[PDB]
């Protein structure tokens, strides 16, 4: 069974050939590829252009999403095997999946890491649990990694600068201030679908504490070698942004520090500077921005920057219906 | 772009035309004029009514509505501007709008005031933050007006009454108890309504400190001037009452105790006796009662009262369907 | 007006005539039977299976569901008559069934007892309010009996001996351990839907202080004198086993400590070992087992049985969505 957790795991034909289905249901929007289908959006947290994107794309395709959120309407999930139940947990994933899969098509999950043990959230044990015992198609709406988000992110990419091919480009993958340490996910999708689509790819961050988990770093290097392009880790803003084409911000807690974030707060707060503002941007090479959204105006980016024509987080967000209903369609 | 925001922003034969459509509609609920078309209702606060006719309308006229609620399932929003985003809010109603209008093709928002400081509450910044922002009409799902309640309202009695003309009657707008102080959004629409109707209107409250905002106030004599019937501030319950056609009650808090409730508790206790009863609507002249709910049985209108042939708030409450669909149907 | 309150307020020809449509409905899912109809599903308690099986349902049959939940996105509802609504209840049930009524054409509620009262809660007062207000057909999506799962359980009992014959059956209804005390609706309806098909049904429990409610104890003992089956009371595990055809197990607090759960607390930790094991399951008659979910893993029954060929728990719940579209079509 194909499911759509990484896409990583997919060959590139297979990844292009989601992105021209893109391109293409945003010229022709309305189908009938889910016609009389269902597929079930499983939220464990919030969400507001995932669950939208979603819902829409099934309704234009003919189908029905259902969405559901664990411990608000629906029940609490259980994860662990061979556990005995007496906790806050009233059923386990081995049922909800194959229960599920007897009324749904597809089944879409967002879950987002704990935050206590990092050694814990990057099994990603939701996801693969789903895709474990659903008898259809998973597809990830974000967990430690958001592929949907990436290709949004790249058909808007291609479509900037007119072409499929966007090798040699200079991107740049720069954390940003937050109040709080958040997830990892979008930057680790960021870092491998750039190195996937061949791109010179550096990873700007304060120290090496924000230097996103091996796995990742993993990824690149062979997306790197296979595609061409490269990577590069850096701690420098300037010489970062100079001549970079793209600029793609997200903000991220520092690894080493999962379950003790009590200590990186003093830390990250000493490099709010990392601020995507018009004096950075205006090191690029007329380089295009983008952010996953949601974004805090003035502490991520300012607001001169996020109206600025040159960036294209908009058009990116609008991209997220178009390519997972490509992905839909692709699995259904 | 043409948004519904109030009903004093559009022309009476404009009015009218929704009025006439969302007759039609009611004879004819199944229709095309929605076909793969969507609309995003966001919600700040509780509905029962306004979701769910909305939600159908959306579903009778073959389009979609997506239901958000920012803080609960969607992110929450800010809506200041240039301000530095490290409080609770995650991203700002620039993004939030111009993202949803590339998903959805109409945007209805209820957001009601704080109840903190009427200064802030008046400027109905929700509400113009998203008509500035997004790219597709906007809706008024109830704020400090409420436009579609009104229409709803007025449909009711135009079909009570068996005319489209109202002219001439006596209309009487009176505040009721309820244990803590309410939004003033009703009251103000169904002076803005009745008085553009051109009905004989009588704003029935306890003391002077229950009088609407001025611009409420200022609209109507405005509406009484254009269409020939007449407005007047009264606080003797049994003259108000008297010969009466119509009898529209609601509870509001005083606008001169905005963000300082705690003494004006106490004043509002020793008037629960304006509650809707047989024997002032036994004043009336056969008169009509009704409310938008919902409702506190026995507080603001006694049983019998509720229960009476005279009462229309069943019927008004069934209009908000179909009237929402004309408006859906108009801005599209 | 007929409404699907209770099995047993059906008759058996009905009943089958239901069950003979699920059949049908689950080999050709698409329909037009509520084209362009909805269904307003009020959920005062959560749910997976429920909400999402009755809004596939009615998607799939041309209608929409809309699902609503008092207290949290619609406004609390009031069910006493002539009380003064001063409390936390903002409306009655009265306005609520009758605005309900001119939106939808069917209205499906979930309201599970408040556990403080079984006097007040044996009332049925949720259910019996909205029949009796509602101008179209009530469907109860579990109360304090759960018919939609009967049908669910008859069904799938059915398919898995291949006939709609299950008389002389050996059916055992046990209860098990669970942390905290939970409804008897899904026991008392097993017991009222395996002796209106006419089993020989078996109540097994600890002590007599978890004996159903007298109502269907009676419902029970006229349904087995009309079908020809059999109603017994046990309290020893390995006699009522034996030979069983049939095990359905559910946890449920003990009615006479209702309101009183302290002390009730310390007798149920002492009969975990009610537990539907590999063991007990031995002594059956190659018996099928099946719960109605949620259900926690080692708790309830082990890995082991939940996970043996004779489990039918999925199929059980995946025709939820079956009889509910049945019932639908039938009432609409
Ligand atoms: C700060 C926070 O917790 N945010 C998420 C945003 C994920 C990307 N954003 C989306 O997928 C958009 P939506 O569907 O509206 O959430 C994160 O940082 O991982
Ligand atoms: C007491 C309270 O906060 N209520 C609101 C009711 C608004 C009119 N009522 C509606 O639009 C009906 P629904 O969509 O179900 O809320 C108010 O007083 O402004
Ligand atoms: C422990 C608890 O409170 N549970 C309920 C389950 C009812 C049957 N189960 C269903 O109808 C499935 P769903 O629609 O997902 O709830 C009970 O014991 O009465």
Same mark, same amino acid.
């Given at each position: 069974?194909? %499911? ?9 034909? #297979? ?5 021209? =289905? +893109? ?6 929007? $309305? ?23 979603? #819902? ?12 559901? =959120? ?26 909800? /999946? ?32 789903? /895709? ?19 290709? +949004?992110?790249?058909?808007? $990419? ?7 091919? $966007? ?22 999708? +960021? ?30 290097? =062979?997306? !790197? /070698? ?8 850096? %701690? *420098? ?7 970079? *084409? ?25 490099? =709010? ?31 001169? !920057? ?23 369609? /692709?699995?259904?």
């Amino acid at each position: 069974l194909k %499911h759509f957790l990484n896409t990583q795991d997919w060959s590139r034909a #297979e990844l292009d050939a989601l992105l021209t =289905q +893109a391109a293409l249901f945003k010229r022709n929007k $309305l189908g009938s590829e889910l016609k009389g289908k269902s597929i079930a959006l499983v939220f464990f947290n919030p969400s507001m252009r995932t669950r939208t994107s979603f #819902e829409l794309g099934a309704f234009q395709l003919g189908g029905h999403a259902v969405v559901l =959120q664990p411990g608000k309407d629906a029940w609490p999930i259980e994860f662990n095997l061979g556990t005995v139940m007496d906790g806050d947990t009233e059923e386990h994933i081995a049922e909800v /999946a194959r229960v599920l899969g007897r009324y749904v098509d597809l089944i879409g999950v967002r879950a987002f890491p704990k935050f206590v043990d990092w050694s814990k959230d990057r099994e990603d044990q939701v996801l693969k649990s789903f /895709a474990k015992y659903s008898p259809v198609p998973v597809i990830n709406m974000e967990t430690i990694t958001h592929p949907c988000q990436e290709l +949004a992110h790249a058909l808007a $990419l291609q479509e900037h600068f007119g072409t499929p091919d $966007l090798r040699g480009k200079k991107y740049v993958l720069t954390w940003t201030y937050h109040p709080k340490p958040l997830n990892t996910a979008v930057a680790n999708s +960021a870092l491998t679908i750039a190195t996937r689509m061949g791109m010179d790819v550096t990873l700007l961050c304060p120290t090496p504490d924000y230097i996103l988990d091996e796995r990742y770093m993993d990824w690149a290097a =062979q997306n !790197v /070698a296979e595609s061409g392009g490269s990577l590069q880790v850096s %701690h *420098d803003i300037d010489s970062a942004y100079a001549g970079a *084409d793209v600029v793609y911000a997200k903000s991220w807690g520092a690894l080493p520090f999962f379950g003790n974030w009590e200590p990186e707060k003093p830390i990250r707060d000493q490099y =709010q500077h990392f601020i995507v503002d018009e004096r950075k941007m205006a090191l690029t090479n007329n380089g295009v921005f983008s952010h996953c959204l949601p974004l805090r105006r003035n502490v991520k980016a300012t607001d001169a !920057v996020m109206d600025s024509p040159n960036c294209i987080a908009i058009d990116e967000a609008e991209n997220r219906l178009h390519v997972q209903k490509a992905i839909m369609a /692709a699995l259904v």
